[PDB]
Design a binder for this molecule. Structure first.
Ligand SMILES: O=C(N[C@H]1CCCC[C@H]1C(=O)O)c1cnn2c(O)cc(-c3ccccc3)nc12
Ligand SMILES: [Zn+2]
Length: 358
């Protein structure tokens, strides 16, 4: 039975125009910040990445919330893996010429995430007061969050771009060979990779000089060209339910996270856990016949089921970094995974009551 699922998808599709209205305000403010950021010597090669739920056509439930990525090309870099994490790294430089534009942010031979982000926040803070066209406020440190016309929030991330070969930790990741082909995997790995400033906490405290790997652009490519067949979702006979299953999984977590926001258990779960689990199910079911539109109910049930297995077994590997486990006991406590398991199972057993705005 896919009736309630198909109902939700139609309701979610009605948010397209509202998201579009808000997006216009954001494109205006962002184009302005990039024009002013490009003036500084350090952030000269800064640009808009254009990755995320929005550009992957999976943006469900929040027109007053946008996430934007700012890429900055860094030329000849050397990476040093932090504490055998496989996902966190220190950014070092190797050549002599020319005079590196980021020299000002070096805290030794290592590029400071804090000094980099401070200048980024400083230029952004300086340019939001100069702009009079719309009312823009910058929200406090908790990378940079704006509030346009007192409604739209914009989360702005800075990401370093490296056209180098992907780190060794990714060597056995992106298992798309039997689904999207090895030909495609070769083409995709030749593309750049990004590093977003994210500190790593070992329990005692922060490492505020590390950068985490990002493949937002590859996730978009894979989601927007997702079939084994090149004509998947181009004709009546070749329509699939891949994206619809991801939209439903994303919405399932958001609704349950909303329902229990005052409880604090589900705070550690994110749409990235859902998306990662989704890509794993795509690897398990490589055929477009396994994703038939008529089988939506059965396909979403495998996604729910796989996600629950990950919660029980405390095992959800990053799709690009196999050795990094997103459901490690050190990241998410067992009681929290058990609460989310309890809730998802109840929902599945009662024809998803949370789909009806709880
Ligand atoms: O939200 C995200 N992730 C959350 C889920 C658990 C771990 C960090 C959490 C957080 O940063 O809040 C997230 C959104 N894109 N993206 C991405 O492109 C890569 C990674 C990633 C994560 C771990 C290891 C290697 C790469 N994460 C993300
Ligand atoms: Zn398709």
């Amino acid at each position: 039975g896919a009736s309630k699922l198909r109902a939700v998808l139609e309701k979610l599709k009605l948010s397209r125009d509202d998201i579009s209205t808000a997006a216009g305000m954001v494109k205006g403010v962002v184009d302005h910040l990039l024009l002013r950021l490009k003036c500084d010597s350090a952030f000269r090669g800064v640009g808009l990445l254009n990755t995320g739920s929005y550009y992957e056509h999976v943006k469900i439930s929040a027109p007053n919330e946008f996430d934007v990525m700012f890429k900055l090309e860094v030329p000849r870099i050397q990476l040093e893996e932090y504490s055998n994490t496989r996902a966190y790294y220190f950014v070092k430089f190797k050549r002599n010429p020319k005079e590196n534009p980021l020299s000002q942010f070096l805290e030794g031979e290592i590029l400071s995430a804090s000094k980099m982000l401070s200048k980024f926040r400083k230029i952004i803070k300086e340019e939001i007061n100069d702009i009079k066209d719309t009312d823009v406020i910058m929200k406090r440190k908790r990378a940079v969050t704006l509030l346009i016309s007192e409604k739209i929030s914009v989360d702005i991330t800075l990401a370093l771009e490296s056209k180098s070969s992907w780190p060794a930790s990714t060597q056995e990741g992106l298992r798309i060979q039997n689904w999207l082909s090895a030909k495609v995997r070769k083409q995709l790995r030749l593309k750049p990779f990004y590093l977003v400033p994210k500190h790593a906490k070992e329990g005692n405290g922060f490492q505020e000089e590390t950068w985490r790997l990002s493949f937002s652009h590859i996730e978009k490519e894979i989601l927007n060209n997702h079939g084994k067949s090149k004509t998947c979702c181009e004709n009546k006979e070749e329509k699939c339910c891949r994206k619809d299953c991801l939209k439903l999984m994303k919405y399932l977590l958001e609704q349950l996270k909303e329902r229990f926001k005052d409880k604090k258990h589900l705070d550690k779960f994110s749409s990235y856990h859902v998306k990662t689990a989704f890509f794993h199910v795509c690897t398990q079911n490589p055929q477009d016949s396994q994703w038939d539109r008529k089988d939506l109910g059965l396909c979403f049930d495998n996604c729910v089921t796989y996600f629950l297995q990950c919660l029980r077994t405390e095992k959800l590997e990053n799709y690009f970094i196999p050795e990094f486990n997103l459901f490690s006991s050190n990241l998410i406590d067992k009681r929290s995974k058990e609460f989310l398991t309890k809730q998802i199972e109840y929902e599945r057993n009662n024809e998803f009551p949370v789909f009806d705005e709880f």
